Amino acid sequence: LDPGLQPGQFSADEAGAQLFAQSYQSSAEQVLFQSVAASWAHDTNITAENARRQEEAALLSQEFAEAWGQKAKELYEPIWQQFTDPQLRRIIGAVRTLGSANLPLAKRQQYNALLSQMSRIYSTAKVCLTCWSLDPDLTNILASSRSYAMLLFAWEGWHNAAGIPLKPLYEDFTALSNEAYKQDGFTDTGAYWRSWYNSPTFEDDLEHLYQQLEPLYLNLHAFVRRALHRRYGDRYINLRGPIPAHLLGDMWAQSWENIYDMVVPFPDKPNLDVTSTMLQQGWQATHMFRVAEEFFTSLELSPMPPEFWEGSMLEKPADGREVVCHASAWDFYNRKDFRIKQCTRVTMDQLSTVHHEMGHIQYYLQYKDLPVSLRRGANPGFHEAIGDVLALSVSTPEHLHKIGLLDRVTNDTESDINYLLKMALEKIAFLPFGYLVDQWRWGVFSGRTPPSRYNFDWWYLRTKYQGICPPVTRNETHFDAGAKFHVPNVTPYIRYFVSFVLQFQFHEALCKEAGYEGPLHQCDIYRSTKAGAKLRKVLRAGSSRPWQEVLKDMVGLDALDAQPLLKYFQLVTQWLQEQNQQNGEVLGWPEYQWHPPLPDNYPEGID
Numbered sequence: 001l002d003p004g005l006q007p008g009q010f011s012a013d014e015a016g017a018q019l020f021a022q023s024y025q026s027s028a029e030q031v032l033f034q035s036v037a038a039s040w041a042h043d044t045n046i047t048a049e050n051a052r053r054q055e056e057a058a059l060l061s062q063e064f065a066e067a068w069g070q071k072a073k074e075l076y077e078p079i080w081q082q083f084t085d086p087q088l089r090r091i092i093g094a095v096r097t098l099g100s101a102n103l104p105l106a107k108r109q110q111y112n113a114l115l116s117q118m119s120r121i122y123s124t125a126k127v128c129l130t131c132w133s134l135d136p137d138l139t140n141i142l143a144s145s146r147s148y149a150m151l152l153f154a155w156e157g158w159h160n161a162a163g164i165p166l167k168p169l170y171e172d173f174t175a176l177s178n179e180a181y182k183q184d185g186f187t188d189t190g191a192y193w194r195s196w197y198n199s200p201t202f203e204d205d206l207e208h209l210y211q212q213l214e215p216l217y218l219n220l221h222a223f224v225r226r227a228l229h230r231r232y233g234d235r236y237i238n239l240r241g242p243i244p245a246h247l248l249g250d251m252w253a254q255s256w257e258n259i260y261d262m263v264v265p266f267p268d269k270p271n272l273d274v275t276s277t278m279l280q281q282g283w284q285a286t287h288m289f290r291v292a293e294e295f296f297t298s299l300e301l302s303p304m305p306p307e308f309w310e311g312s313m314l315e316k317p318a319d320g321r322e323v324v325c326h327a328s329a330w331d332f333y334n335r336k337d338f339r340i341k342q343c344t345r346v347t348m349d350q351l352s353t354v355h356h357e358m359g360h361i362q363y364y365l366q367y368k369d370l371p372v373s374l375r376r377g378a379n380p381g382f383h384e385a386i387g388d389v390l391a392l393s394v395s396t397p398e399h400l401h402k403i404g405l406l407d408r409v410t411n412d413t414e415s416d417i418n419y420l421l422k423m424a425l426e427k428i429a430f431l432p433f434g435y436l437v438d439q440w441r442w443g444v445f446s447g448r449t450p451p452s453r454y455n456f457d458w459w460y461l462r463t464k465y466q467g468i469c470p471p472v473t474r475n476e477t478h479f480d481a482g483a484k485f486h487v488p489n490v491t492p493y494i495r496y497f498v499s500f501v502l503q504f505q506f507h508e509a510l511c512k513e514a515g516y517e518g519p520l521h522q523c524d525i526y527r528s529t530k531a532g533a534k535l536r537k538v539l540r541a542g543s544s545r546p547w548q549e550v551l552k553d554m555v556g557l558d559a560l561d562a563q564p565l566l567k568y569f570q571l572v573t574q575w576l577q578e579q580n581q582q583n584g585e586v587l588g589w590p591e592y593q594w595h596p597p598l599p600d601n602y603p604e605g606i607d
């Protein structure tokens with residue numbers, strides 16, 4: 001570790017710490033920066049050499065964390081936690097969690113190499129027939145094809161190609177991760193990840209929220225299953241069984257907006273999927289990013305700085321470089337460099353993703369002058385909610401009209417149902433998936449789910465919560481959880497469930513602050529400087545204060561609350577319940593064993 005980066009001397013008392021954190025920060029920014037830069041160089045250009053460089057940067061960060069962390073415990077382990085400065089004990093608390101720096105050097109190196117190899121396997125996996133990538137090729141197939149066999153080829157191909165080789169690496173990763181966090185006093189890595197929400201009742205609170213939301217999902221599920229039955233027929237859809245997992249528009253069946261055209265209740269009203277209009281008008285990634293930016297500046301939040309435009313990767317490279325296409329936002333911790341890395345495609349759903357990613361960047365811009373340990377969301381769910389809240393305004397028919405994407409204007413009950421159904425496909429359909437992923441992973445970290453049951457427990461959860469089934473037989477050689485980005489890329493998931501509840505709480509509060517008095521689902525906060533100021537207060541806080549307090553200031557309640565989501569969807573919630581009753585549906589999937597048959601001649605009968 002460079003002499004300039006090593007910790008010096010301090011008093012073994014409460015006073016010996018503010019100068020400590022200032023010195024830490026001076027060096028931490030340099031270390032964080034070099035780590036983020038090496039990660040960027042790999043993720044935008046996957047090579048063995050860039051993996052090696054990223055692994056060297058990771059070792060340095062671990063050296064740095066070990067040095068600064070052993071000092072805390074030398075000086076303060078018996079006595080720290082006690083009074084004056086709130087932001088200071090947060091900064092200290094973060095410095096003394098060693099994590100992977102607890103591993104001996106050989107295991108640090110193994111851990112870093114595992115992360116690099118898992119990332120490569122996921123982001124370079126292909127389905128061969130010249131071979132198809134996940135993004136754009138398989139993603140486009142899942143979104144647009146109505147060929148059962150083609151969808152199956154893409155789904156099976158992807159899950160086999162990505163999941164199977166990940167399994168042994170994921171096992172080794174899990175063991176090392178647990179070994180690391182156990183030395184910080186956590187029972188397993190999952191307990192560490194949950195500790196970020198600073199709630200002794202987190203898992204119970206989540207379960208109680210899910211109980212309120214589940215009826216909405218079950219009714220959406222039953223209606224969508226019927227719509228699919230009318231297209232695919234009785235061979236491939238069981239009206240009392242789980243929906244085959246490849247028919248819902250998305251590789252993970254995690255959101256269903258791409259099958260909107262099959263489910264739209266009133267097809268004679270204006271067409272709310274504006275993708276075809278975006279393509280007709282010649283939108284490109286650049287336009288999408290500038291349009292999102294202009295929403296942020298309408299609220300008097302910050303534009304994207306020049307360094308963002310110069311350094312970001314906004315389209316998949318056309319030079320045959322391998323890249324991590326999965327959309328992500330990047331803080332370089334130098335208060336200057338902030339970037340998005342997205343293989344942007346021209347679609348409505350991608351415009352929402354652009355807003356999502358830009359919300360992260362806006363957070364980074366607003367807290368860039370805080371101490372580096374405080375440059376985080378109030379919790380990770382807050383970070384995920386910011387862009388989505390703006391996208392809720394952008395997606396309204398009235399806003400789409402303002403930006404030239406929806407010519408017809410209508411305000412009638414049928415049009416409302418269409419809109420709320422489209423939004424339900426995006427937001428309600430996600431809820432079970434958002435909830436189940438870290439239920440799976442928490443069980444893996446705890447040892448409740450050993451390698452012998454990775455797939456059995458994954459599919460238990462997928463069927464339990466989503467009411468889907470794999471469209472081909474699976475066994476434990478398959479590792480279908482590994483075919484979802486966040487698993488091999490070690491990114492926690494519960495943040496997205498939290499976000500999907502939180503964003504409606506934020507939307508309600510911002511709409512009220514804006515002076516809007518109509519139905520919550522027709523609110524557009526565009527050009528509300530007052531809504532902008534309220535949001536800015538959240539963003540500038542970082543993690544300086546407990547999330548419960550930040551939330552209370554913003555929305556008037558100190559807790560996650562489903563009521564604003566329920567209020568937003570009330571009309572369609574009622575409508576779906578009535579339609580399923582009238583159509584004679586069974587809610588749920590009592591034929592829980594059911595899987596669909598294979599297509600004739602599969603896979604040979606596909607062009």
Ligand SMILES: *[C@@H]1O[C@H](CO[C@@H]2O[C@@H](C)[C@@H](O)[C@@H](O)[C@@H]2O)[C@@H](O[C@@H]2O[C@H](CO)[C@@H](O[C@H]3O[C@H](CO)[C@@H](O)[C@H](O)[C@@H]3O)[C@H](O)[C@H]2NC(C)=O)[C@H](O)[C@H]1NC(C)=O
Pocket residue numbers: 398411517518519522
């Ligand atoms: C789409 O129509 C919604 C319903 O409009 C109402 O009913 C129609 C049949 C028609 O007669 C129309 O003229 C009616 O107003 C609109 O929602 C309504 O928007 C009103 C204006 O913001 C709102 O009003 C009052 O709301 C409260 C009282 O509950 C007062 O505090 C406030 O001062 C307003 O005067 C009304 O409540 C609201 N209705 C509902 C059911 O929410 C909606 O704005 C419109 N949308 C668009 C995009 O045009």
Ligand SMILES: *[C@@H]1O[C@H](CO[C@@H]2O[C@@H](C)[C@@H](O)[C@@H](O)[C@@H]2O)[C@@H](O)[C@H](O)[C@H]1NC(C)=O
Pocket residue numbers: 473474475476477478
């Ligand atoms: C796991 O499954 C592998 C391939 O899939 C198999 O073939 C299809 C047609 C299904 O109907 C079912 O028979 C299987 O899922 C097999 O190669 C492999 O042997 C299986 N793994 C183990 C340990 O048995």
Ligand SMILES: *[C@@H]1O[C@H](CO)[C@@H](O)[C@H](O)[C@H]1NC(C)=O
Pocket residue numbers: 045047048049050321
């Ligand atoms: C990709 O990385 C390699 C090192 O592995 C380097 O030689 C090459 O120039 C990089 N390409 C781009 C376009 O940055």
Ligand SMILES: [Cl-]
Pocket residue numbers: 193196380381492493494495
């Ligand atoms: Cl999280």
Ligand SMILES: [Zn+2]
Pocket residue numbers: 356357360383384
């Ligand atoms: Zn995000």
